[PDB]
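Translate sequence into structure tokens.
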Amino acid sequence: HAGIFTFEEPVTHVSESIGIMEVKVLRTSGARGNVIVPYKTIEGTARGGGEDFEDTCGELEFQNDEIVKTISVKVIDDEEYEKNKTFFLEIGEPRLVEMSEKKGGFTITEEYDDKQPLTSKEEEERRIAEMGRPILGEHTKLEVIIEESYEFKSTVD
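Result follows.
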């Protein structure tokens, strides 16, 4: 109902000496309220842990107002005799932002100092909310190819 969350480009090439690369994500055709889109890096042939690339994960905030978000990845300087590297970026399913996780929880616990008031609740409100859930595109995956370009060097001279 929300539209298509997906990468602007299915495959992106990033320079060895760029510093930080940013991938623009396509927002839903119908931007409704506030939606969070989680993401993470995937080690393809690239070394993770800040070895070929600084791996990252987090959440992007999209809204009716927020237009595009970017994944910022620190591209690490080449190892020893590496030709090029590539890793993937996966954005997870868009999660509709509930503005109130805190609905209350203030009930008299008739016990002097105890933290269990026993709130016996279980509502599948997430499924109730999913009637208008934000969804993602056909294929959500970015192939990030770290290619050597010393022509443009992040170290300015």
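Note: The first helix runs from residue 125 to 129.
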